[PDB]
Amino acid sequence: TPKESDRCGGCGKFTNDFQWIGCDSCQTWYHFLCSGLEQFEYYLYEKFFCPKCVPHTGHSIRYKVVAPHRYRWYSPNEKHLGIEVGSKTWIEDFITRENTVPSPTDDEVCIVEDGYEFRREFEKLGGADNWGKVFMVKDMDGLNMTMPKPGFDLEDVVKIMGSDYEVDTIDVYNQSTYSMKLDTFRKLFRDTKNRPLLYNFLSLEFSDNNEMKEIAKPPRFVQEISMVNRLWPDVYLPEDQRPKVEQFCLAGMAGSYTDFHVDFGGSSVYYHILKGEKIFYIAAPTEQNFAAYQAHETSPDTTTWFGDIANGAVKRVVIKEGQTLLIPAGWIHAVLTPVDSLVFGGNFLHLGNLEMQMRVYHLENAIRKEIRSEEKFYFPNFELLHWMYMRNVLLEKITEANQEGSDMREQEKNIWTASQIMKAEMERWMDRELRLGPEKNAILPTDDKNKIMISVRKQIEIQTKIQNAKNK
């Protein structure tokens, strides 16, 4: 392979993007990033012909599929090993037995005819402050959720986003994530008979695209409770700090499988199925389920489906075209996409699930500490967002109540209880940071954090005395 003296034929600079591949014809060497290859192709070709050579050599030659039941499907050294979850072989089998996973109880999932029935049922169960079960809504009428007119599809997405827009795409059989241009995904998607590999994107975030951001929006009730929306309203606080996760477009090939996970930061999500179908395998956020999921995530084993060792916790919910799925914090889920699909969805945090949010946060942190793969990613600016919400929103409310001599439990009890819960988690962050220094990714200076905490402590103490002053 490449020695000190050879030139990248792309950038002409000398000695994964920045690893090397050589053209089997030219013999010239390239940085992967300079080779003309997209990231999802880096590992695909056994014989690589660079773009200067293709006109006379024909296309690069891919590795032969030798181990369809392994992530490393190109490795003869793995033919003998066990079938890995998510591999082509595993999925083709799972499809035949998946409909035998039990349906969920009425306590776990509520199916309703439309948004009006959703609103009734939601409120009957306590509203957002008490949101604890999954909802599937058959018709979006009444959800007050802006979605594109049916028929709308990938073609229109690439038209709006642009052909060269990069999307983080799951190589399903390899169970790994690589960037791929939207137009490239479009090309592979529209080729229905030739699918050596399956692709699935989950994270095309379009909230900063002026055209798209108007086409597809969260249900109004989500906008009303989203903590990010409260802090960075429709448009103080830098735009480049906003967690950008509330407007995602998702598209997947038939057969695609996403393995069990809890959404990052313990966020809640909505999904509207514009085209196709999704099947969710879900388990409720109990302490026992978390522990079992934690064990599963930290195990080196790749052959056991979580559903099979979850003591019957995993349930099956089908969501078909035109239907909408709403999941609160902490639900453990895997997803199969049985048919080519186009989906709009998004993640959000809200005060009503604050406790569960922090529990998922602790789980995440526990898992992180034990496995060496930060390729999993977590809620962007999670901690920062809380410092800002405490300071700009919660502290403000407590202070105003204190100046008015008001007992918050009367008209603002939820604000008061959320503050206490948020504060206790933030005391823990503060201590950690005074003990170990800032995080790698810390925007707020240690000192600014301390000023906020000093002020929070004080107003909490003042409100507590106001509440006690009614004692006799």
Q: Kindly state the smallest distance separating residue 263's Cβ from ligand AKG, in Å.
A: 5
Question: Toward ligand AKG, which CB reaches closer, 170 or 456?
Answer: 170
271 carries a ligand binding annotation: yes
* Listed ranges 14-22, 86-94, 118-126, 249-257: which one lies at the site for ligand AKG (CB under 6 A): 249-257
Q: DSSP for 205-219?
A: E-TT-TTHHHHS---
**Residue 149 has which token pair?**
């007119």
Q: How many residues bind Zn ion (CB under 5 A)?
A: 11
Q: Kindly state the smallest distance separating residue 127's Cβ from ligand AKG, in Å.
A: 24
Question: Toward Fe ion, which CB reaches closer, 171 or 263?
Answer: 263
Contact 32, 21 (CB under 8 A): yes
Give the number of other CB atoms < 10 A from CB of residue 299. Answer: 12
Q: Kindly state the smallest distance separating residue 276's Cβ from ligand AKG, in Å.
A: 10
Q: What are phi and psi of 117, to 5 degrees?
A: -65, -30
Contact 389, 227 (CB under 8 A): yes
Look at residue 278 and give the partner it binds from Fe ion, ligand AKG, Zn ion, none, a contact being a CB closer than 5 to 8 Å depending on partner kind: ligand AKG
Using CB under 6 A, which of 335, 385, 418, 426 touches ligand AKG? 335
Using CB under 6 A, which of 171, 246, 263, 277 touches ligand AKG? 263
Could you tell me which residues come within 8 angstroms of residue 28 by beta carbon, excluding any fewer than 6 positions away?
A: 6, 7, 9, 22, 50, 52
User: Does residue 272 bind ligand AKG (CB under 6 A)?
Assistant: no
Using CB under 5 A, which of 29, 31, 206, 242 touches Zn ion? 31
User: Does residue 182 bind ligand AKG (CB under 6 A)?
Assistant: no
278 carries a ligand binding annotation: yes
Distance separating alpha carbons of residues 177 and 169, to the nearest angstrom: 5
Question: Toward Fe ion, which CB reaches closer, 68 or 338?
Answer: 338
The CA-based angle 316-317-318, given to 5 degrees, is 125
333 carries a ligand binding annotation: yes
* Listed ranges 75-83, 185-193, 248-256, 400-408: which one lies at the site for ligand AKG (CB under 6 A): 248-256
Give exposure, 426-442, as e/b (b: 16+ Cβ within 10 Å).
beeebeebeeeeeeeee
User: Does residue 388 bind ligand AKG (CB under 6 A)?
Assistant: no
User: Does residue 177 bind ligand AKG (CB under 6 A)?
Assistant: no
Binding site for Fe ion (CB under 5 A): 263
How many Cα atoms sit within 13 Å of 375 on the Cβ side? Answer: 9
* Numbers of helices and strands, H then E, in the chain: 14, 15
Burial class (CB within 10 angstroms; exposed 0-12, middle 13-18, buried 19+) of 200: buried
Contact 363, 265 (CB under 8 A): no
* Listed ranges 85-93, 126-134, 329-337, 457-465: which one lies at the site for ligand AKG (CB under 6 A): 329-337
Question: To which residue do tokens 């190589």 refer?
Answer: 171
User: Does residue 202 bind ligand AKG (CB under 6 A)?
Assistant: yes
Using CB under 6 A, which of 35, 39, 174, 258 touches ligand AKG? 258
Distance separating alpha carbons of residues 444 and 457, to the nearest angstrom: 19
Question: Toward ligand AKG, which CB reaches closer, 333 or 449?
Answer: 333
Question: Toward ligand AKG, which CB reaches closer, 335 or 452?
Answer: 335
Using CB under 5 A, which of 10, 36, 68, 142 touches Zn ion? 10
Could you tell me which residues come within 8 angstroms of residue 18 by beta carbon, excluding any fewer than 6 positions away?
A: 31, 32, 33
CA R_g for the chain = 25
109-114 and 134-139: which strand pairing? parallel
Using CB under 6 A, which of 70, 217, 315, 333 touches ligand AKG? 333
Instruction: State the binding site for substrate.
Output: 258-263, 271, 278, 333
Which residues are at the interface with ligand AKG (CB under 6 A)? 200, 202, 250, 252, 256, 258, 263, 278, 333, 335, 337
Which residues are at the interface with Zn ion (CB under 5 A)? 8, 10-11, 23, 25-26, 31, 34, 50, 52-53
Instruction: State the binding site for Fe cation.
Output: 261, 263, 333
